[PDB]
Amino acid sequence: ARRRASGENLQQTRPIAAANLQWESYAEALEHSKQDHKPIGLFFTGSDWCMWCIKMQDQILQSSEFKHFAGVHLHMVEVDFPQKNHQPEEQRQKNQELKAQYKVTGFPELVFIDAEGKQLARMGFEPGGGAAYVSKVKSALKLR
Structure with missing residues (x-):
């Protein structure tokens, strides 16, 4: 297949393309949601010891489909x-409170909440890739 081997088209497509994920603060998230009404996804993980979490981050959160959908x-x-903690005391206190608040035990766990703190849906690690994961969240949050 010469066509498959060929590439690097001169004509540029999708000017929008894709952008990296923009992390917001818990306090900031709600502020925006109170105004924008958009759901908040809290990513609970172990950056230095949970391998499955790395996989979720690397394969779904950092995936193009996820980035576009979430952005x-x-x-x-x-x-x-x-394991090696360097977050400010205030941030750690808030993080622990949140972990308990949404009854988060296992990681990786992504919980969707509204600006009033109501849970719309929750998901963990699920094979299929970024495209498939976003489809699931859409159905869960009733986005259409």
Whole structure:
């Protein structure tokens, strides 16, 4: 297949392309949601010891489909529990409170909440890649 081997088209497509994920604060997320009404995804993980978490981060959160979907439709908040901790005391207290608040036990776990703190849906690690993961969240949050 010469066509498959060929590439690097002169004509540029999709000017929008894709952008990296923009992390927001828990306090900031709600502020925006109160105004924008968009759901908040809290990412609970172990950056330095949970391999499955790395996989979720590397394969779904950092995936192009996830980036595009979330950049447009969601507010993302990072909540990490590393072995080597260097987060400010205030951040750690808030993070622990949040972990308990949403009854988070297993990681990786992504929980969707509204600006009033109501849970719309929750998901963990699920094979299939970024495209498939976003389809699932859409159905869960009733986005259409």
